[PDB]
Every structure is written in structure tokens, then in C-alpha cells.
Amino acid sequence: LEEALEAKEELERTNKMLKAEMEDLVSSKDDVGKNVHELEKSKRTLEQ
Amino acid sequence: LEEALEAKEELERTNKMLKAEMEDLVSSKDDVGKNVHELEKSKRTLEQ
């Protein structure tokens, strides 16, 4: 049980680390962007 | 190894608390900037 919990928490730690690096890379150069007209295409492909 | 695993679990608890608080601080840092932060904060979950 303890080793299963250890695997789960280390995976969660890796997820938190990647989230933190993404988040503190967010703040620099986010001013404008393009439209999401093709984003819904990915959503409908996922739906089908 | 039980003592080692209990120490590891306590360290994981402290680490996750610290990670949560610093992530909350980082998120609260940005309040006036662009709203595309949540766009990619959902995109990450999209690929996941």
C-alpha cells in the first residue's frame, strides 16, 4: 500500500512540477493571439 | 523502511502544502494581464 501511494505521489509531484514551470513561463510574453476558429475542429473530432 | 516511508510521506505532505501555497501566490500575482492564461491552462488538460 505504501509503495503504491509513493508511486501516486511522485507522479503527482511530476505533474505539479510541470504545471509550475508552465505557469511561471506564462507571465512573460502573453499580449495577443490568434482566433480559436480551428479549436472547435479538435473538439468535434474528440466528440466523434 | 517503514520509518523511511513515513518520513517520506511527511515530507511529501509538507512539499505539497508548500507547492500549493506558492502556486496560489503565483496565480494571484497575475490579475490585470491577458485572459489567455486560462486558455492554455485548459489546453494542458486537453492534451492530458
User: Nominal resolution in Å?
Assistant: 3.4
DSSP for A1-48, written as a single string:
-HHHHHHHHHHHHHHHHHHHHHHHHHTSS-S-----TTHHHHHHHHH-
Distance CA A15, CA B13 (A): 15
Task: Estimate to the nearest angstrom the gap between the alpha carbon of B22 and the chain centroid.
Answer: 7
Contacts of A30 (CB under 8 A, 6+ apart): B33, B34, B36, B37
What residue in B sits closest to A20 (Cα-Cα)? B23
Distance CA A31, CA A36 (A): 16
Q: List chain A residues with CB under 8 Å of B29.
A: 27
By what technique were these coordinates determined? cryo-EM
- Using the Cβ of B9 and the Cβ atoms of chain A, whether some distance falls under 8 Å is answered with yes
User: What is residue B35's DSSP assignment?
Assistant: T
The vertex-A26 CA angle with B32 and B29, nearest 5°, equals: 40
For residues A30 and B41, the answer to whether their CB atoms sit within 8 Å is no
Q: List chain B residues with CB under 8 Å of A6.
A: 5, 8
Distance CA B40, CA A19 (A): 11
